[PDB]
Amino acid sequence: MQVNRLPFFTNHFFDTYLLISEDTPVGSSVTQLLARDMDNDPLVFGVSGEEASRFFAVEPDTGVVWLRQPLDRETKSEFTVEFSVSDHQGVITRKVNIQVGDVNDNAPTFHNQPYSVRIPENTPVGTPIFIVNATDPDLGAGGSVLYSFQPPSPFFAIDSARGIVTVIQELDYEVTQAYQLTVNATDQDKTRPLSTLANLAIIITDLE
């Protein structure tokens, strides 16, 4: 009599990796497991492991793997996951590295708030008076920050790359004692840029 032969997986992704974008909706199919059995046994598929199980479900009879809860690359950017296939006499398992793809889903967060600075009325044109900084944890253009004033100001400019704020026109206390500027920090994602606002208070101190 023929001893049972155990099934084996055929997917070529076990030899490299599987990519899933972090924007995959819950309930979507992310791949399909494939296996053969020399006895032509009907096969049941599954997933193994505590954490893998919380993110992936497998339709037992077809091997379609789907997404049980949202992925977030900033929170966990990869998994090692173990899939199983059984012919009812034995179970075999095999691991795959799953890489999580980025999308731009974060806006920048500013550092060292709140932002306020006292400068004297006689501070000359060209003088750097303040530095703003924000970071953004997305990859690529989605994580590179640009700074600006919204709207721009006739008395101050901010360097778009470095966040350095300078005086660009002589000040005058009697006309304006204090300026409330809105600073915008945006990422540079091509299709969905995201941005964030902070206030910058500039208080002018008297002289004559």
Binding site: L6, T16, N97, G101, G140, A141, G142, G143, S160
Partner: protein, 236 residues
């Protein structure tokens, strides 16, 4: 407003798709192997009037070399090997290509992941040079008479997946012809040996069983094999 946004283009990707650039190569690939043909970053690094500066960050152990002009990444493996198997266990390399826009001063990091694919560059290896079993002449046929390949006492293979999984088979021994007829391995995965014919101490007291282990590489022509002997002595 936004007439000047053309100067922010340099350092951005000259392709669509996701931000990470992900490629695969074989373990033990030769020095100078191309890892990325073309990073496809907008702008010109080097030459007499570059619009960008390009360089590598988090290049741990200097596995990756960059040619900024061609925007090409290469493997730096002189004096060593890129080994996915124990003891080295390099399954992947991740580096950042930092891109500085010269005109506006913006910096963009482009992540590159290199996934290392296993080769069947390792053969099964037996823990001992030879193996031994004693069997009583009255052992019933069907009885398991040797279990010594259990729990890494037998053959192992340091590759991953099927490349590293072992099957055991008995071969004919031209110098002890009946040994493959008297003993069998019915379950090739365990390599346990079972008695298949009644023994007779007055006829034959010693058997030399040739056992071959093989791995389970997908291509039959790339499978590796190793041989051992099991000597079976009868007792009274």
């Amino acid at each position: 407003q936004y007439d000047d946004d053309w100067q922010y283009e340099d350092c951005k990707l000259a392709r669509g798709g996701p931000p990470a650039t992900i490629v695969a190569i074989d373990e033990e690939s030769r020095n100078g192997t191309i890892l990325v043909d073309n990073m496809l970053i907008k702008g010109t690094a080097g030459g007499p009037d570059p619009t960008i500066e390009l360089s590598l960050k988090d290049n741990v152990d200097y596995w990756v070399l960059l040619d900024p002009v061609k925007q090409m990444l290469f493997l730096n493996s002189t004096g060593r090997v890129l080994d996915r198997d124990p003891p080295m266990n390099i399954h992947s390399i991740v580096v950042q290509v930092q891109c500085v826009n010269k005109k506006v001063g913006t910096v963009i990091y482009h992540e590159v992941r290199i996934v290392v694919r296993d080769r069947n560059d390792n053969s099964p290896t037996f823990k001992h040079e030879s193996y031994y079993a004693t069997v009583n002449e009255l052992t019933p046929v069907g009885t398991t008479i040797f279990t010594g390949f259990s729990g890494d006492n037998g053959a192992t293979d340091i590759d991953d997946g099927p490349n590293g999984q072992i099957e055991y088979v008995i071969q004919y021994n031209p110098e002890d012809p009946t040994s493959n007829d008297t003993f069998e391995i019915p379950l090739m995965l365990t390599g346990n040996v079972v008695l298949r014919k009644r023994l007779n101490y007055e006829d034959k007291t010693r058997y030399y069983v040739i056992i071959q282990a093989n791995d389970r590489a997908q291509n039959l022509n790339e499978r590796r094999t190793t041989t051992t002997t099991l000597t079976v002595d009868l007792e009274h």
